[PDB]
Design a protein around this ligand. Structure first.
Ligand SMILES: O=C(O)[C@@H](O)[C@H](O)[C@H](O)[C@@H](O)C(=O)O
Ligand SMILES: O=C(O)[C@@H](O)[C@H](O)[C@H](O)[C@@H](O)C(=O)O
Ligand SMILES: [Mg+2]
Ligand SMILES: [Mg+2]
Ligand SMILES: [Mg+2]
Ligand SMILES: [Mg+2]
Lengths: 387, 387
């Protein structure tokens, strides 16, 4: 059982709201004709440079060629050797490793004729509660449009949301005020995500005013600069609500655990390098008696299915999670997208071998892009995912 | 005075020893016809992917077009906004910002008809002592060849070297023993560089063994994993010799300062984003009463000229530095390469406006490569710069 070839399909898929993201669909072929499919999700984050895919294929092939896909520890070690963790939230190498590792999970599962779910420790639940993201308010005139989003998504089944905050506290506060007034308790906003925009003391003042509105609030996310472990800790001591932060490297995670800097570890395959690495991170959190939440970069159905299997296998996810990618994109590259119902993301049919997703070649062609080059976009839009 | 265009010239230049590095020569054009030259030095470091230069030029021009090159603070802020610091030694975004910023210095200095030296605070010295690098020993069988290197370079005038260690302690020690034996005190090895290969305790044991050979030893560099501030600190308390570490981000530098983790800050433009960023790092070190050494990624004459001017302006460099790029590369892209004599790097003629170097178009064409794609190379070779 050996890897013989690799394909990287670049696609560009816009969100209903306008932001255009580029992703790379992975295909790992083997001597026995079995192919694993994966996804290097959302490369459209800073830094503002793009990776040469022709060169990348050669580099990845040199690593993968001839290897036994079941040697996940060995392969992941070699992947990290060539694409080291950087202590950066959006390291493109993390997205790359993620795509190879989840494709390998698909491959192995298919070979054994089982769902990736059974390859990750089975099921603890069959679905995980998620939330729909509400855009960061830059100006107060945006409040009305965001309220419309909440009203429509609620009718569609999403009763839990998360709100990006920190740019215009007056606008954030007006939105929250309006939401409580119109929906009362019908809607919950489980997280206020600062996106590392404020120093911890400024975030503290912001949190103090935003928490005057508690619509089923579950956590305050990234309320300090990236890697400001001491700041997170000081804020954790001054905040009644749990503090959550993304895990983007093992070193960063180790430091947050050792300093007891946070309460909830936001873990997502794409930011840590794949399912193998995400599992390690999740288990490290478990060993430290810490809570976990499944984060997201907002991936397509392949990437979402992968994390759905992982999320449904963990015993330490006791809060609302974030992956709602397929709900944001106007299209996808699969025959059947993952399912969302009543605000829950369902793990794919446990009876279907592999990820439980099938690629649609006509869609890969439809959304094909020549490379991962950037289009005109501002820093504000890259941070808020707006257009 | 406004920026009107940008050119990025990829070049591939092998070292006498075999390793082939790719660099990017920068040209910033203005409405008045004045052009600044710069260098994005040595992209040939992990991660194993490459940046699309056609895309990069568009992104960089988007930032630079129409700007006044004298607005260094404003431009560097916008550069950092799009190519953020990642807490990673070899972030390619740092190499990119470095090339733009040193080109801007060349441009501004030329416009005013002065050397970049007078734009950076003048001179404190006219030359800086540097050292020649000795390859990391992976096998004891390499000792002989490395001794020949010392013999040859000493004859050329390099009486100070630095040694990469940590892979084969028995070989490291054999080499050091042989050097002392064959050269006595004629040669000095100012630094033993562990390249972050060992956890601090293992490093402690290695140091205790190696420091039995003190041939003018000045510092122990990177004796702990990347960003292991507490490990660096613990080692600083158990080691009599100064501990030095590279500065790859302001967050990392501030944490090392706050924890008094190291004694010497190894600062080089390429790893921190350019001359503007390197000056800030050097001044932060000065404010903290810390020593500084001019590090290197081994750049061509354009990049070496830039750092030479910086190095000769600082008052807190009281140890041997590392830039010997033009002595390692078989070729260059300039009319006259920077001068090295008796183990000293001389800053370019202070009477020559700009960086003090001139591009040789025929050489630029000679070493031109289609892109920054990777060729066959192993992780060991990338960390040891061997072939
Ligand atoms: O939790 C967060 O910070 C968000 O999921 C953040 O990662 C977004 O930028 C996301 O990646 C997106 O593209 O919408
Ligand atoms: O001090 C160091 O770690 C070296 O200068 C290191 O950066 C080398 O890898 C250098 O960049 C080279 O290309 O030789
Ligand atoms: Mg978040
Ligand atoms: Mg994303
Ligand atoms: Mg070093
Ligand atoms: Mg280098």
């Amino acid at each position: 059982m050996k890897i013989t070839d690799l394909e990287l399909h670049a696609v560009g898929i816009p969100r209903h709201t306008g932001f255009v993201n580029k992703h790379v669909i992975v295909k790992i072929h083997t001597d026995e004709g079995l192919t694993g499919i994966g996804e290097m999700s959302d490369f459209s984050h800073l830094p503002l440079y793009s990776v040469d895919l022709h060169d990348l294929k050669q580099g990845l092939l040199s690593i993968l060629l001839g290897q036994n896909p079941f040697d996940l520890m060995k392969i992941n070690k070699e992947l990290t050797d060539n694409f080291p963790e950087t202590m950066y939230y959006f390291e493109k190498g993390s997205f790359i490793r993620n795509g190879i590792d989840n494709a390998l999970h698909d491959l192995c599962a298919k070979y054994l004729d089982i769902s990736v779910s059974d390859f990750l420790g089975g099921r603890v639940k069959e679905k995980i509660k998620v939330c729909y993201p509400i855009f960061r308010h830059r100006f107060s005139e945006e409040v009305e449009s965001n309220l419309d989003v909440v009203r429509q998504k609620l009718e569609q089944g999403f009763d839990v949301f998360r709100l990006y905050v920190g740019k215009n506290l007056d606008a954030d506060e007006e939105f929250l005020s309006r939401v409580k007034e119109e929906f009362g308790s019908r809607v919950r906003i489980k997280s206020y995500d600062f996106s590392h925009l404020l120093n911890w003391k400024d975030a503290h003042r912001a949190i103090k005013r935003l928490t005057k509105y508690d619509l089923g609030l579950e956590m305050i996310e990234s309320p300090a600069p990236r890697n400001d472990f001491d700041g997170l800790y000081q804020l954790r001591l001054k905040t009644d609500y749990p503090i959550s932060e993304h895990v983007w490297s093992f070193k960063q995670q180790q430091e947050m655990i050792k300093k007891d800097a946070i309460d909830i570890f936001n873990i997502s395959p794409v930011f840590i390098g794949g399912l193998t690495s995400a599992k390690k991170a999740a288990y490290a959190a478990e060993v430290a008696s810490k809570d976990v939440v499944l984060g997201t970069t907002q991936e397509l159905s392949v990437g979402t299915a992968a994390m759905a299997h992982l999320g449904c296998s963990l015993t330490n996810i006791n809060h609302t999670s974030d992956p709602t990618g397929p709900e944001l994109y106007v299209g996808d590259v699969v025959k059947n997208r993952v399912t969302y119902k009543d605000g829950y993301l369902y793990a794919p049919d446990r009876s279907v071998k592999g990820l439980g997703i099938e690629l649609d070649e006509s869609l890969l062609a439809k959304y094909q892009v020549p490379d991962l080059s950037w289009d005109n976009v501002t820093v504000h839009q890259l941070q808020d995912r707006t257009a």
